[PDB]
Structure formats: C-alpha cells, structure tokens
Amino acid sequence: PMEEEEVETFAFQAEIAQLMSLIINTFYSNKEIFLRELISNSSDALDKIRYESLTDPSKLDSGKELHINLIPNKQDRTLTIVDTGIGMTKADLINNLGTIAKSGTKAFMEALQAGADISMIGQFGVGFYSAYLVAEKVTVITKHNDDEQYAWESSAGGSFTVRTDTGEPMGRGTKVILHLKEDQTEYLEERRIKEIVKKHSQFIGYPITLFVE
Ligand SMILES: Nc1ncnc2c1ncn2[C@@H]1O[C@H](COP(=O)(O)OP(=O)(O)OP(=O)(O)O)[C@@H](O)[C@H]1O
Ligand SMILES: [Mg+2]
Numbered sequence: 566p567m568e569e570e571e572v573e574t575f576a577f578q579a580e581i582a583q584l585m586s587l588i589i590n591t592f593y594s595n596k597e598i599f600l601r602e603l604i605s606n607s608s609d610a611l612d613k614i615r616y617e618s619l620t621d622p623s624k625l626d627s628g629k630e631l632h633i634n635l636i637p638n639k640q641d642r643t644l645t646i647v648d649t650g651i652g653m654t655k656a657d658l659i660n661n662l663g664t665i666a667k668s669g670t671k672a673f674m675e676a677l678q679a680g681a682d683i684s685m686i687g688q689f690g691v692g693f694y695s696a697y698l699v700a701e702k703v704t705v706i707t708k709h710n711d712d713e714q715y716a717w718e719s720s721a722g723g724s725f726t727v728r729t730d731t732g733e734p735m736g737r738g739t740k741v742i743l744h745l746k747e748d749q750t751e752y753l754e755e756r757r758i759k760e761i762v763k764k765h766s767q768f769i770g771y772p773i774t775l776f777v778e
Contacts, residue, residue, distance in 0.1 A: 573727045577663045580670040581691070582723045587677060588697050589721055598684045599699050600752070601765035602692040603646045603741055607633045608769045610650025610739060617651070627710055627737035633773045635762075637753040642745050644699075644752050648771075649738040652709035655727060658717045662705065663725050667691055697721060699752055700743040708735040 577585065611631050618625045628649050636645040653661065669689030676685065686695050696703050705717040714735055719725035743752075751757045755777045762773065 570728060570731070573659075575659060575664055575725055575727065577719075577723055577725060578666050580666060580674070581663060581694070584670055584674055584691060585694055585697060585721050585723075587674060588683070588694055591677075593683045593698060595682055595684050596698040596749070597752075597761050598686070598765065599695040599743075600646075600758070600761050602687050602695040604633060604762070604766045604769060604773070605687060606693065606741075607646060607648030607650055607739070608771060610648055610652070611771050613651035614649070614737070624710060627708075632771050633769070635758060635773065635775045637755070637758065637776075637778070639750075639753050639778070642747075642750065642753065644743045644745060644758075646741045646743075647738065649736070652735075652738050653705075653707040653715070654709045654712045655715050657709065658705070658707060658715055658727050662693065662717055663719070696741070696743055699745055699749040701746050702744040704742040704744070706730050706732060706735065706740040706742070708737055708739075710737060 576582070611633070614624065615631060631649055634645075634647040636647065637643075638645070667690040670691055673681075673686065673689035673691060677683070683695060683698065686692050702720040703718070706714065707717070708714040714730040714732075715727055716730040716732070717725060717727050745752060752761075755775065758775055762775075766773070
C-alpha cells in the first residue's frame with residue numbers, strides 16, 4: 566500500500582483478560598462508576614505532573630494548565646476524557662495497561678463472585694477496566710514529556726495494540742476515548758454526565774469542563 570504503520574499486538578496478562586470477560590459478560594447495575602474511575606486516573610496523573618514540576622518547572626513547558634475535559638460526541642457515539650496529566654511513555658502503556666500482573670486482580674475477581682458491587686473495582690488496582698462496563702472499545706492516546714504520542718487500543722478478546730499515534734498532537738497528557746455500547750448512550754447526555762460527576766467525582770483537585778455540542 567502507499568502508507569505503512571507499525572503495530573504492536575500484546576496479550577493481556579491472563580488474570581486481567583479474565584477480569585475483562587467477567588466485566589463484559591456479567592450483568593452489573595451500577596455501571597455509572599466507570600466515569601468516576603477515569604476521572605480519578607486523570608486526577609492521579611495531574612498530581613503526578615504537579616509533583617514533578619515542584620523540583621522541575623521545565624516539565625510544565627508542554628502546557629501549564631492542569632485540568633480535565635469531558636467530550637461527548639453523539640455522532641461518533643464516543644465519550645472522551647482528556648487530562649493534561651503526566652501522560653504515559655510507550656513502556657508505561659504496555660506495562661501498566663494490560664501486560665503486568667496486578668496484586669489485587671485475583672482478589673477482586675473473588676469479591677465479584679461473592680457478589681461485590683463493581684464500584685469497589687478501584688480499591689484493587691484495576692479501575693481502568695470499569696470502562697468496559699459501557700464501552701465496546703477503548704482507545705487511549707497519550708503523550709509523555711520526553712517521548713512520542715502513542716495510541717493504545719482494545720475491544721477485549723484478550724488483546725490490545727500499541728502504535729505511534731498519527732492523530733492531532735496533544736502537548737502533554739492522556740485522552741481516553743470510549744466507543745460506547747448502543748444501550749449506554751445516556752452517558753453522552755449532558756444532564757446524565759453532570760449528575761454523575763456531582764454524585765461521584767466531587768473531590769477532584771482540578772477544574773473539570775464538560776464540552777457540550
Ligand atoms: N489518565 C491517565 N494518565 C496517566 N496514567 C494512567 C491514566 N490512566 C491510567 N493510567 C495508568 O494505568 C494504570 C492502571 O490504572 P487503573 O485505574 O486500572 O489502576 P490504578 O489507578 O493504579 O488503581 P485503581 O484504579 O484500582 O485504584 C495506572 O496505575 C496508571 O499508571
Ligand atoms: Mg484508577
């Protein structure tokens with residue numbers, strides 16, 4: 566073909582693959598907590614960049630504003646969570662989002678069997694995967710300070726890919742893009758989103774902005 570793109574395909578760590586099918590194939594009632602989990606991740610990443618700037622203000626040259634944006638797109642049926650946090654290196658993506666085992670995974674699977682609410686997911690070190698409560702597919706674009714912009718992607722099925730991102734440059738941070746299931750479109754509604762952020766994400770030490778089309 567005219568153009569070529571390098572893709573790297575990785576198997577999810579076995580327990581995490583198993584946690585993902587559990588999340589996807591079980592019925593759960595309290596799905597809205599996915600949003601709280603992604604906002605926390607953005608909040609953590611922003612704490613991190615903030616921490617690093619204390620000793621090295623140069624680290625904020627890639628953008629000084631520390632914040633989180635929420636972007637529903639009804640045309641594409643996507644909900645995007647953007648932060649100007651620390652972002653992830655390629656290796657961060659690979660190690661931290663699927664490939665390296667987590668201490669709490671087995672235990673969280675155990676708790677789910679007993680009938681735990683999925684809301685507890687974030688106590689175990691696997692909160693990200695709550696996204697698959699409402700998304701058939703998740704794309705993570707990320708730009709860390711001394712590395713290139715990358716795109717992580719997976720629709721489950723036990724696998725994810727990482728590639729150099731060919732999209733619009735970010736400066737610094739992470740964009741999580743949720744391709745929503747057809748029965749989960751309420752999470753594109755301005756009212757629903759506002760309700761959910763007020764109920765679950767009111768201890769975020771950063772400004773959050775909802776962009777409404
Ligand atoms: N928005 C983000 N910016 C930077 N790194 C992120 C972001 N989201 C996820 N990560 C990385 O992926 C890892 C997995 O996140 P996940 O939410 O599954 O677990 P956690 O936040 O470490 O713990 P838990 O969510 O269970 O309290 C995180 O530790 C973090 O390093
Ligand atoms: Mg988390």
